[PDB]
Design a protein around this ligand. Structure first.
Ligand SMILES: *[C@@H]1O[C@H](CO)[C@@H](O)[C@H](O)[C@H]1NC(C)=O
Ligand SMILES: *[C@@H]1O[C@H](CO)[C@@H](O)[C@H](O)[C@H]1NC(C)=O
Lengths: 98, 49
């Protein structure tokens, strides 16, 4: 899902996962490597690409809460309602009222 | 032709694990060691990927 840099905003992107624990992402993704037929150590044309590898919660329950990081500015002497969004897989099997 | 080989095996549950060929008797094999041959559309042979 292509996007564009906003003047005030960066890329804020989601991707719907329906797959396995091992996942890896990147942008400027015209390739994985440029065209490594050879370099014979002469010189390599290397632009930056931000490729990321992530891994999974080993949750056999599959019920968990994701907590976005508040890695931005922070005035002290305050409180801060953390934003967290969760799931319960298979609903609750018996659960209770609370 | 029937290849049921996934990209990754999609072994949901607790863990994943790869594909592998089975070892068991078949209706195809019953008519083979019987000695004869047959034509039919129903599922006789196992779905060997
Ligand atoms: C980028 O995604 C938008 C949203 O769906 C789409 O309309 C557009 O065609 C895409 N741009 C490209 C690279 O075609
Ligand atoms: C994809 O996002 C949806 C919400 O839009 C979520 O319910 C789902 O668990 C995510 N991945 C899938 C399809 O498992």
């Amino acid at each position: 899902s292509n996007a564009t840099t906003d003047e005030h905003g960066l890329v804020q992107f989601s991707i719907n996962t329906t797959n396995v624990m091992g996942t890896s992402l990147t942008v400027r993704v015209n390739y994985k490597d440029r065209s490594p037929c050879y370099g014979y150590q002469w010189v390599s044309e290397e632009h930056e690409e931000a490729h990321h590898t992530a891994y999974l919660v080993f949750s056999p329950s599959k019920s968990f809460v994701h907590l976005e990081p508040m890695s931005h500015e922070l005035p002290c002497g305050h409180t801060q309602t953390v934003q967290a969004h969760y799931i319960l897989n298979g609903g609750t099997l018996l659960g209770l009222k609370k | 032709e029937d290849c049921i080989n996934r990209h990754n095996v999609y072994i949901n549950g607790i863990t994943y694990t790869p594909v592998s060929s089975t070892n068991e008797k078949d209706m195809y094999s019953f008519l083979e060691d019987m000695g004869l041959k047959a034509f039919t559309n129903s599922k006789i042979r196992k779905p060997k990927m």
